[PDB]
Amino acid sequence: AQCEATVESNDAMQYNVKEIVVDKSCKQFTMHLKHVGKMAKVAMGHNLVLTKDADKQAVATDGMGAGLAQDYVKAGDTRVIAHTKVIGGGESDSVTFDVSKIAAGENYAYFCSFPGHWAMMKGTLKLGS
């Protein structure tokens, strides 16, 4: 609703939403992430990272090497448009980004960069109204 969306992540390594459509009327957009499971962030942590589809694996790979304290996102990665912190069960986080950083027709992927999660936790985000 409005210029925001909510994605729930669980203990089975899955997002409940696979596609997010950003309305052209939005100048800013907010992504809310909820970890609805009961596992600790050291075993089943989740975040939400947004990049062009092409940059997915590269960003997830470098992110793994950043560590948990860095929310598994390489500090100052220019390929990441927006990202939340890594959360454990019973928690949540939000991230707001500039819609101008998004282009029509372009393909964007949101995924979890916690080690090994990217291969199963991913969705598509795009501008469209």
Number of residues counted as binding Cu ion (CB under 5 A) = 4
Distance in Å, CB of 11 to Cu ion, minimum: 10
Q: Phi then psi for 117, rounded to 5 degrees?
A: -75, -25
Q: Is 83 annotated as a binding residue?
A: no
Contact in structure between 53 and 107 (CB atoms under 8 Å): yes
Please check if 13 is assigned to a binding site. no
Interaction residues for Cu ion, span 23-82 (CB under 5 A): 46
Tokens of 11: 């203990």
Q: Which of 32, 51, 54 is nearest to 113 (CA)?
A: 51
Q: Between residues 34 and 117, which has the closer beta carbon with respect to Cu ion?
A: 117
Instruction: Please name the amino acid found at residue 93.
Output: D
Q: Which of 33, 114, 118, 125 binds Cu ion (CB under 5 A)?
A: 114
If the CB atoms of residues 60 and 98 are measured against Cu ion, the closer one turns out to be 60
10 Å CB burial of residue 53 (0-12, 13-18, 19+) is middle
Q: Alpha-carbon distance 122 to 109, whole Å?
A: 7
Q: For Cu ion, which residue of 22, 112, 122, 125 counts as binding (CB under 5 A)? A: 112
Q: How many residues does the chain have?
A: 129
Which residue's CB is nearer to Cu ion, number 31 or number 112?
Answer: 112
Interface residues with Cu ion (CB under 5 A) are 46, 112, 114, 117
Feature table: binding site: 46, 112, 117, 121
